[PDB]
Amino acid sequence: GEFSVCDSVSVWVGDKTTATDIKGKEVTVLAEVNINNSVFRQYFFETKCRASNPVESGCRGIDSKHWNSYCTTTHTFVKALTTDEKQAAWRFIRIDTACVCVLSRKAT
């Protein structure tokens, strides 16, 4: 929980129902997964940005004489039991994992 150029929020979500697979196709996330005749909930640990601009100028801490910046969220891939309505399988879906600052050089 270190002071950063971008403010984030993390939480455990055990009810995700909708998602984007690795191929970028939307899919539905099965609520109960059954392993070896044992059924479990699918959990994800997600981290979102609090705002795209923690501060007026963009990300906090930036040398704003020379850059433009903003906070955005990034992804990791986790296997999940999903369905796209055609075939039910395990796919890798995106899960937001961080809020990083992207930069752009100020145009002079």
Question: What is the nearest approach in angstroms of a second copy to the Cβ of residue 7?
Answer: 10
Question: What is the nearest approach in angstroms of a second copy to the Cβ of residue 87?
Answer: 13
Contact between 29 and Zn ion per CB under 5 A: no
Beta-carbon contacts of 5 under 8 Å, excluding residues fewer than 6 positions away, are: 54, 59, 60, 61, 62, 69, 71, 101
CA atoms within 13 A on the CB side of 76: 11
Contact between 108 and a second copy per CB under 8 A: yes
When the beta carbons of 28 and 53 are compared against a second copy, the nearer one is 53
Structure tokens at 61: 């801490």
Residue 91 marked ligand-binding = no
Binding residues: 41, 43, 79
